[PDB]
Amino acid sequence: LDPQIVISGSTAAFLAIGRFVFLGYQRREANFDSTVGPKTTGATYFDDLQKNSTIFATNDPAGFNIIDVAGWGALGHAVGFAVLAINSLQGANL
């Protein structure tokens, strides 16, 4: 069953459809700074824990940082392990 094949393929497919397919949609959706403004305008330490203290710059041209990577690879690992587990009991219901 080659779990390396399965999980590498799931992660690669999800990273691909996150980079090439659903990146524009996710950027259109995640741009909430709108009526929906910042959580805090204050200068307290606890107001700073809610600000984006570190913008994750990426030299990827489409803007695919370690957070997009983390998310799409997490979905890929989850789906690959789902495939492996549903194959683990050598069958499915219907």
Partner: protein, 733 residues
């Protein structure tokens, strides 16, 4: 003149009467009404009080553990749990006579003890605890955790550790961390405990901190996990010949989906619960990655809420402006939390009796009864508080301008429709339930029980048959051995589930009949009328036709005077106080039904309930009167037994209840004049006018009268029924 005690109120500190003491006792935790209260200081004091509540909870658990270890029989109960009674703690009462020292010597103890109706023995035996040293160490650890939370509550009140107002109003991060870590990683760690400790200890293998790094939870350690061969963790489950706590019929699996019950313990499989918490942990961890934090991804709850505006304007503005309303109102959050927590407390009660999670539970009948009644009354109180705080929100926190046209304002817009329809459902259910019960009573009185209205609950029976109960012959979904729902589960939970649900000696989907129909409709009447009172106090909270400016008078206030026809019990607080009676009656019906159904099941006489629950003289004769015999004979002119304490507590609760009647019927104005006469008497009595009061005696206020009467009422209700329940279940079993 000006006193010192109600530091949070200068108006109470300047009050020269006894009302100052009471109201400072009862306004202490209404932080918003405190003098000089800022919203930030409010949230910070709430945070500290939450730390204190956690510390108290962990100390209480530490004390339970400590007393079960020190004065309990846990090391003997694990040997013969079906036959040995669990000791709660020892009794040292110098008022005891020798007959009482002899009568309360139970459970193999050396002296007088209390028998645990708590279930903590079954719980701790199921999760791997076998010795008294385990419980001792757990109690020490939980006392340390309590001290740690106390220190945290002190610390986060200090200047450089007091969080900002916005840190509390950060909902996305709190939700992410509380779903992912507090719910999810906690469930993952509990799965780890079950896989490493509880399941091996149920297989007879001792796993503790001394050796848990040296024993494998599975013979194939973590290879099935990192290779995706997860079914290897379900290969050899525990057999049907398995005896809990031993290796005879052990099994090697740690994650199963067997379904049903462990046959020897009549409890859930520990591997099923491990897999349960693993699945739930994964689901909650991925759920806690939903909301937006400092990393650029995720949702903003404001966007989700403001986007969910239906077209057709069927909800108006929809959920526009609702994020601000929920996030800025602590009473909205508290009402939502109490609603959910009470609903899931009722879920706990309804599922722990049908699917007993703990070993040798469901054979400890007193424990089952006590747990169900406990969690259902807790749930009823919590659910009354949910609506109470919803009303407090509508009064204190609701801004009609910032909720212009959204679902929340759309509620108040058609509140008369809601209240009148709840009125219709309550009225219908009461009329017809009481009428059918009275018809059946009259028919049994005239000796013609074949003329009763015995409506078969075919809808709930159809549901039961959809779950695989083959007693009714519906043959629909899982009772149909040819359906796809049945076929697709046969490799899975369904064999165990269907062996467990068709066994009529457990409580998994009990057989129901017309008595169950009638009492379920009584339960519905109770729910509908309780929520009628509560919804009507929550929606008429900001004003009515009788009192349109009610929001200006607060949540609690005595009345608006005898003008405009009379305005007694006008406030939302009074609606809550009226709904607590109906809640207690609802949960009393619920727990009566539960206890009688299960008493007739445990006695092998289900026909008694099936034949006597269709009329209320059967409830009075065959449940309340029949089961009271051993209870009221706890002490008699011919001696006493261990039910003496429950007889005493029975009479105690009756007394408290009746005393509450004093504060509920008799109102302030008789007592103020009586107290004036007593004041005169004391000021004019020689040798006693030397002693004088510092706080002027006054009768209890109207709101305080209602509170104290409801408190005596509820405490008596609760103590009476707990005494009766334990004494009627512990007397037979």
């Amino acid at each position: 003149a000006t006193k010192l005690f109600p530091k949070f109120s200068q108006g109470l500190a300047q009050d020269p009467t006894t009302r100052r003491i009471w109201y400072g006792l009862a306004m202490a935790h209404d932080f918003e009404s405190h003098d000089g209260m800022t919203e930030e200081n409010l949230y910070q004091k709430i945070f500290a009080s939450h730390f204190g509540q956690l510390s108290i909870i962990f100390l209480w658990t530490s004390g339970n553990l400590f007393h079960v270890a020190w004065q309990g029989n846990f090391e003997q109960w694990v040997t013969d749990p079906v036959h040995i009674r669990p000791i709660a703690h020892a009794i040292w009462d110098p008022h005891f006579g020798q007959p009482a020292v002899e009568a309360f010597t139970r459970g193999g103890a050396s002296g007088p003890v209390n028998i645990s109706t708590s279930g903590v023995y079954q719980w701790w035996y199921t999760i791997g605890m076998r010795t008294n040293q385990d419980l001792y160490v757990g109690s020490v650890f939980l006392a340390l955790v309590s001290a740690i939370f106390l220190f945290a509550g002190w610390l986060h009140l200090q200047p450089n550790f007091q969080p900002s107002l916005s840190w509390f109003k950060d909902a996305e991060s709190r939700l992410n961390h509380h779903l992912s870590g507090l719910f999810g990683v906690s469930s993952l760690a509990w799965t780890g405990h079950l896989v490493h400790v509880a399941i091996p200890e149920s297989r007879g293998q001792h796993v503790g901190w001394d050796n848990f790094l040296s024993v494998l939870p599975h013979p194939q350690g973590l290879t099935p996990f990192f290779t995706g061969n997860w079914a290897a963790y379900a290969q050899s489950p525990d057999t049907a010949s398995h005896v809990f706590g031993t290796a005879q019929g052990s099994g090697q699996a740690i994650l199963t989906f067997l379904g049903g019950f462990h046959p020897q313990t009549q409890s859930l499989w520990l591997t099923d619960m491990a897999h349960h918490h693993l699945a739930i942990a994964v689901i909650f961890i991925v759920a806690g990655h939903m909301y937006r934090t400092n990393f650029g991804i995720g949702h903003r709850m404001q966007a989700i809420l403001e986007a969910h505006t239906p077209p057709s304007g069927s909800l108006g503005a929809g959920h526009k402006g609702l994020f601000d309303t929920v996030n800025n109102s602590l009473h909205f959050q508290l009402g939502l939390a109490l609603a959910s927590v009470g609903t899931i407390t009722s879920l706990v009660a309804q599922h722990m009796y049908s699917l007993p999670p703990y070993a040798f539970q469901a054979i400890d009948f007193t424990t089952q009864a006590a747990l169900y009644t406990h969690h259902q009354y807790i749930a009823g109180f919590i659910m009354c508080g949910a609506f109470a705080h919803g009303a407090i929100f509508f009064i204190r926190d609701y801004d009609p301008e910032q909720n212009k046209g959204n679902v929340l304002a759309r509620m108040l817009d058609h509140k008369e429709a809601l209240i009148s329809h709840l009125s219709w459902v309550s009225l219908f259910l009461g009329f017809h339930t009481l009428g059918l019960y009275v018809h059946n009573d009259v028919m049994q009185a005239f000796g013609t029980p074949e003329k009763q209205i015995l409506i078969e609950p075919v809808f709930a029976q159809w549901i039961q048959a959809a779950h695989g109960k083959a007693l009714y012959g519906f043959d629909f979904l899982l009772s149909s051995k040819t359906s796809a729902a049945f076929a697709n589960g046969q490799s899975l939970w369904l064999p165990g589930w269907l062996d467990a649900i068709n066994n009529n000696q457990n409580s998994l989907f009990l057989t129901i009949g017309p008595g169950d129909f009638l009492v379920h409709h009584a339960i519905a009447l109770g729910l509908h009328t309780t929520t009628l009172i509560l919804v009507k106090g929550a929606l008429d909270a900001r004003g009515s036709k009788l009192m349109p400016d009610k929001k200006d008078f607060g949540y609690s206030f005595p009345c608006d005077g005898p003008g405009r026809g009379g305005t007694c019990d006008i406030s939302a607080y009074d609606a809550f106080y009226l709904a607590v009676f109906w809640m207690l009656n609802t949960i009393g019906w619920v727990t009566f039904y539960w206890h009688w159904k299960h008493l007739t099941l445990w006695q092998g006489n289900v026909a008694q309930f099936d034949e006597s629950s269709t009329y209320l003289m059967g409830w009075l004769r065959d449940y309340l009167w029949l089961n009271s015999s051993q209870l009221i004979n706890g002490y008699n002119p011919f001696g006493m037994n261990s039910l003496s304490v429950w007889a005493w507590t029975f009479l105690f609760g009756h007394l408290i209840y009746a005393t509450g009647f004093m504060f509920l019927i008799s109102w302030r104005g008789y007592w103020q004049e009586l107290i004036e006469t007593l004041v005169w008497a004391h000021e004019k009595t020689p040798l006693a006018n030397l002693v004088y009061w510092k706080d002027k005696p006054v009768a209890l206020s109207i709101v305080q009268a209602r509170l104290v009467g409801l408190a005596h009422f509820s405490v008596g209700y609760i103590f009476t029924y707990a005494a009766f329940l334990i004494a009627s279940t512990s007397g037979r079993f």
